[PDB]
Design a protein around this ligand. Structure first.
Ligand SMILES: [Zn+2]
Ligand SMILES: [Zn+2]
Ligand SMILES: [Zn+2]
Lengths: 193, 187, 200, 72
RNA sequence: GCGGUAGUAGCAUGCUAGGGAGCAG
RNA sequence: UGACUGCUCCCUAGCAUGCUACUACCG
């Protein structure tokens, strides 16, 4: 509501008899839990330690070290406290973990992609196009890729090591179960509060 | 069986029987005692005939329910298998020439016998003898079904790759003879 | 259908709840069933209630019925307990010898191969029992070493330097040459010739 | 005698089939022809010649130990 | 001392189910 | 990889019917 304003980037001409309905989906049974119980590790395992470390974010090295000790972790920060680029700088501090980005909204991925292309490489990153306005210059059907961008609605079965779920406030327990069932990893990272 | 009210009645009847046997009671008391135990046996006969029948009926119903659940599981498995078979055979259709011939139809309907004859990317020829081989699959490329086919592999009934140089008049009896030549569509 | 393990008697009964399914004659198989938790024994067909949707495996609860074995809740009126008269029903139920010495078998069958008592009993028993104990020890070792997942290596590093990880909660395997890894690498479909490696 | 040779042909083709002779299309076709002709034969001379021809197939392979099976 | 009615079990018949097998077109 | 139909035997299980068997209720 601004005779209704549409927040779409594309154009379309309607016709006679066309109607818009609040179309929902069929909620499949939820198998995967929200998160596995945590456990204190003795060493930094599950992620590959590289001999070269990143000095680009000196105030996040300790945070990454502490994340590497906990199974699933979440940092309590106000919006804009490195919330959009914490996982981005994590993917560059340790370029040896399968980093998977996911969000509860399809229109909120533009903020993620705004600086990801400047920080993470564009050639080695791609987005799978299902058969609403996103980049189409990427390469489709890239099952085996270090960095994967996709949405929970059309997320196939895959595995990773570090999964980051931005905007955790608007995601429900059903959304958490869907995230954990579509993508299976031993670590889960939640950004926000 | 072991928790019915008739058990206490039977115990009381046995206690009364023991008391009558020890004391030596009259015939009327013995008859009354028998009329109690014997019709408590009537009550327990029913508890061992209707309840035992209900237990058998419940077991039969549970068995039928197990069979129905297994049948539904088999239905789901067969449905998934058939759906996957259809979906994995549709993906090999090469829908380019398939749409080329379907859209060229009068109403999009074509006979089935022409779809492999027009839109199949691989041709398999089974040849019983060299006399039919030289006529049909001569050389490394041949024409059939108004199209040009180039051989990519020739095998015998033993499924052993046999080279084109081996298909000779004198070398024919040295090969298993239903020769299966597989060719690809030329363009 | 072969000679018994603990009694050297012809038998067609394999203790299903055991690891290597040893051949046991009727009397000794009954002794193993009643003196341990090995309530499952096999035959030409497994001893289990053949009525659909049943989940009883205990020979004590299993009764011979028609052309198959059933349980009290699923038995025909002509019912015949499998394990009775000190022997479980089966072939060679009459041409049987048995053995009073069944305590050692019942003790070794349920052992985790983590105590020195298992080694002492294996070294001090009958030859057939010693061979069975050795076979079950090897089976337990290969099932404990295969009780984990596939160690996945995602990066390649310089020579003689690999960061190999473990599973979630998996203890550290022996780093010496005690275990020689002999796998089979998969290119796309088939697992063949990973090579021979020796972790050090 | 004739029934004897036909039954020997049957068992010989059985052992040939058990030896993966059907993996060779020509050899299996020849064995099948010999076996069917022995069973359709009317005289114990043609049948015995075809029996020798069929047994040559078994003797031609190294999959069967001929000394061990001749226990007499 | 009575007809039992009933009942519930050895015995028989049949109907169904399940398994194994044989012949025929 | 193992078709459709028909007839016949054998074993087991449960259920309908003819008995047989005894205890006592009821007049
Ligand atoms: Zn024994
Ligand atoms: Zn056992
Ligand atoms: Zn049962």
């Amino acid at each position: 509501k601004g005779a209704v304003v549409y927040r779409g980037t594309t154009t379309y001409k309607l016709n006679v008899g066309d109607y818009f309905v609040l179309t929902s989906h069929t909620v499949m049974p939820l198998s995967a839990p929200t998160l596995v119980p945590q456990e204190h590790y003795v060493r930094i395992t599950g992620l590959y330690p590289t001999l070269n470390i990143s000095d680009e974010f000196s105030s996040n090295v300790a945070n990454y070290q502490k994340v590497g000790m906990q199974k699933y972790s979440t940092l309590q920060g106000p919006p804009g406290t490195g919330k959009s680029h914490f996982a981005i700088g994590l993917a560059l501090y340790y370029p040896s973990a399968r980093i998977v980005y996911t969000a509860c909204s399809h229109a909120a991925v533009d903020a993620l992609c705004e600086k990801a292309l400047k920080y993470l490489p564009i050639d080695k990153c791609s987005r799978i196009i299902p058969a609403v306005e996103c980049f189409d210059k990427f390469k489709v059907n890239s099952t085996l890729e270090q960095y994967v961008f996709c949405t929970v609605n059309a997320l196939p079965e895959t595995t990773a090591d570090i999964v980051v779920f931005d905007e955790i406030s608007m995601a429900t327990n059903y959304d958490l179960s869907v995230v954990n069932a579509r993508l299976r990893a031993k670590h889960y990272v939640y950004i926000g509060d | 069986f072991s928790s019915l009210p008739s058990y206490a009645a039977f115990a009381t009847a046995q206690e009364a029987y023991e008391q009558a046997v020890a004391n030596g009671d009259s015939e009327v008391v013995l008859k009354k005692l028998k009329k109690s135990l014997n019709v408590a046996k009537s009550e327990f006969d029913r508890d061992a005939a209707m309840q035992r029948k209900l237990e058998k009926m419940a077991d039969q119903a549970m068995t039928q329910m197990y069979k129905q659940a297994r049948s539904e599981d088999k239905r789901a498995k067969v449905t998934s298998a058939m759906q996957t078979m259809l979906f994995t055979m549709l993906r090999k259709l090469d829908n380019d020439a398939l749409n080329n011939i379907i859209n060229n139809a009068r109403d999009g309907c074509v006979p089935l016998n022409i779809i492999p004859l027009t839109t199949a990317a691989k041709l398999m020829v089974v040849i019983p003898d060299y006399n039919t081989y030289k006529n049909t699959c001569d050389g490394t490329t041949f024409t059939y079904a108004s199209a040009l086919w180039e051989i990519q592999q020739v095998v015998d009934a033993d499924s052993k790759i046999v080279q084109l140089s081996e298909i000779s008049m004198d070398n024919s009896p040295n090969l298993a003879w239903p020769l299966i030549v597989t060719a690809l569509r030329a363009n | 259908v072969g000679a018994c393990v603990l009694c050297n008697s012809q038998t067609s009964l394999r203790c299903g709840a055991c690891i290597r399914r040893p051949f046991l004659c009727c009397k000794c198989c009954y002794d193993h069933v009643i003196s341990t938790s090995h309530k499952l024994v096999l035959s030409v067909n497994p001893y289990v209630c053949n009525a659909p949707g049943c989940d009883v495996t205990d020979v004590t609860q299993l009764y011979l019925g028609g052309m198959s074995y059933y349980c009290k809740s699923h038995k025909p009126p002509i019912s015949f307990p499998l394990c009775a008269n000190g022997q479980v029903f089966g072939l060679y139920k009459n041409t049987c010898v048995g053995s009073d010495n069944v305590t050692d078998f019942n003790a070794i069958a349920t052992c985790d191969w983590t105590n020195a008592g298992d080694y002492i009993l294996a070294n001090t028993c009958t030859e057939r029992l010693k061979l069975f104990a050795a076979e079950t020890l090897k089976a337990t070792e290969e099932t404990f070493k295969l009780s984990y997942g596939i160690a996945t290596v995602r990066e390649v590093l310089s020579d003689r330097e690999l960061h190999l990880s473990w599973e979630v909660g998996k203890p550290r395997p022996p780093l010496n040459r005690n275990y020689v890894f002999t796998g089979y690498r998969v290119t796309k479909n088939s697992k063949v010739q990973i090579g021979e490696y020796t972790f050090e | 005698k004739m029934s004897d040779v036909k039954c020997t042909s049957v068992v010989l083709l059985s052992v040939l089939q058990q030896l993966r002779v059907e993996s060779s299309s020509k050899l299996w076709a020849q064995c099948v022809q010999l076996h069917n002709d022995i069973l359709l034969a009317k005289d114990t001379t043609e049948a015995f010649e075809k029996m020798v021809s069929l047994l040559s197939v078994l003797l031609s392979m190294q999959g069967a130990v001929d000394i061990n099976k001749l226990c007499e």
